[PDB]
Amino acid sequence: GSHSMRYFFTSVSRPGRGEPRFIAVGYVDDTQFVRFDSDAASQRMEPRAPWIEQEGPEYWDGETRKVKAHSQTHRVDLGTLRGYYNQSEAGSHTVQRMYGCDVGSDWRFLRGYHQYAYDGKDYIALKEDLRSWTAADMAAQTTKHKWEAAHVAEQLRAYLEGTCVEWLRRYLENGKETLQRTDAPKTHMTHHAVSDHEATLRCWALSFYPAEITLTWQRDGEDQTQDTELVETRPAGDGTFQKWAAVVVPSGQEQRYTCHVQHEGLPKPLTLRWEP
Amino acid sequence: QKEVEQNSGPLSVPEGAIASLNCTYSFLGSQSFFWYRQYSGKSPELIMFTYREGDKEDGRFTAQLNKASQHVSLLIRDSQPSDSATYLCAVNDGGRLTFGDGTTLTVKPNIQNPDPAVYQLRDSKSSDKSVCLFTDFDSQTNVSQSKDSDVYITDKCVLDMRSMDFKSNSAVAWSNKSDFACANAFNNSIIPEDTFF
């Protein structure tokens, strides 16, 4: 299946309390593998996944220099942005950046992205063609012009279409046991009565990876998708994910129906019947 | 393990020929590459840079990058004597540049009309101290040192007279010990023109 490598950067100013708080994180698919926190004691890019730890000292040194460059560059951006938006030196503001690349089943490039936000709003983003820039407003046009003059787009193209995929493919091989694993979801079923004529029946999906999952509902030998309320996929905290879609159609004796779990790995779509 | 390898040189290339300088780097994650030119006693000047596979041309300079083999090249078309210098290959391994030790290139001038000769010059200020000038010789001519006894013999340096449109090679030898003419000044040389009244 498809895979990707994403990098997330967040920088928050702290008027009066020194430098901004900078947090950079790295993911391969749904797995965090690196981290940097300006407030941490190490002041180094740290590993968050076994397989990345095998990289030598030269790699870590470089990632650390690079992430620190980003940190400082975002510190400058915070100051410039106050200027563009004519904001006072008081008050905290946020700068966010994200980029990465996607690859399909053939591990060949599919698309790359590189976006930048300010105070939670789009600021500048590289279009799907890796040449054009989408500039939110007038302030962003000034950035756009500066980045077009420096050919940031083609530098980013060189990275996203090349380096990003090359490393993504390296991490997938080295992290074979983890990244290419596929944990089938452990299904479940429960119900806590509350008057008989209208109780609840639960449909779980636990310890699965990757996060991508699709559990739908069909009934009386047919199918619908408008009422049932489901929760956003949540992290278990041990690498796997959880998700449930409860049955809010209690009719005394729950009529005939079952969950239709769809998830990579599971040979055939699983289906849980309810029976005491 | 050497992070950026380059043959040291001196590499010789005939005036007008293409000079090719090669570089190999070991750091897989290097994303940008640079070439600097450095003349004796001077700081490095940036010639060019690249961040993508392929060739990049700027005048007579063409840089080449092959990531599969982590090799970077530089070609200097129509080489000139003033291209003589040490070329440094630099790789960017993360927010900084890591350099190789450079390749020393010497572009030999083409002398259109060899007129080899050794002349004896005297000091302007009242003195019996003298110098010997070996000039107008071919670039194929290799001036040897004076491993033997005192006396000093400089290496050859290329002289260019703009206007005259005439370049010339030369070398200088001198001593302080008495009884020293320059009929035997330069051990290995061609059959120039030794004169005496």
Added chain:
Amino acid sequence: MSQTIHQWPATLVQPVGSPLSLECTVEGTSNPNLYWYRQAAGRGPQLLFYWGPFGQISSEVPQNLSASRPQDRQFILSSKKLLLSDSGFYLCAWSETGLGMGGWQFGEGSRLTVLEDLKNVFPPEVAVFEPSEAEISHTQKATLVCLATGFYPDHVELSWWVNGKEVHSGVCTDPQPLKEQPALNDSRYALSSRLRVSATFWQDPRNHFRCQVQFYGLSENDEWTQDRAKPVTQIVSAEAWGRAD
């Protein structure tokens, strides 16, 4: 309004145990990355310090040296007590803020020579040798030679001056100096240069030729014990006039 970078001073000759202070100044950009490199003979520049606009990013810990950035565009390198091993060619460089292709230019560099003993320092004696008649009557060209001998350390800057103005065409200066005593470790050096002009130009006595040699040596206040005058930084030259046959 474009970018430039400059460092100072250009050459230094100090004794072991003295303090060092090199300056770097950039113009044309703001919030740049600043770098200090050190270059040894035969080798490429080696990173000492890498600073971003808000502080040091490099993790290296060069012995006996430290850097500081008192202003956005002023970068300083210093040492409280130099070691012999501190001799080198100190290069300063900058890059546009962030991770990009802009910049990557070096300053003109600062050459530093640290010496165990200052008694070995001597400025150059300079002499100019007149063209040979044989040459003139055979090629209608005249070559003046200039010798700068007996100096130490080995960094001098030679230039020719005709009628009060410097000249580059027809000039050839040895790229490096010879040791006058190859065996001696702290041997003194010599260096030659040529200035070739038309016979008719040399034959004109109205023309004036001067070989100028800039030497870098001690500071007026350097510890000195010898009889001879302190061998400080100075310009030593020799001259000659045109001569009709």
Added chain:
Amino acid sequence: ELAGIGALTV
């Protein structure tokens, strides 16, 4: 592997 190029200030 962080990008080593294309990261500039706004």
Added chain:
Amino acid sequence: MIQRTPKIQVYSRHPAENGKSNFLNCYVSGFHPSDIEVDLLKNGERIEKVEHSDLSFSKDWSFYLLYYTEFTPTEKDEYACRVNHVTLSQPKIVKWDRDM
């Protein structure tokens, strides 16, 4: 400039069993700005050893964060998560439902 109110879920890593080590999670997401107060409570009092995941965000730039602490569940003890954020008019508490 945009502020987004957070979604909150409190749950356990593994299915709870009276007298069996497990973790108590509180997953807050879709919020902005990033400054947020999350605490895990045990019968009212807060828990000391509580770590969180490294700040990350979604496609809409909203943040998500996982807070957790190991413990041993039982039926006589009620656990909850106290969240506060500039978007809320008052701290919001959410008990951990054994089966939710």
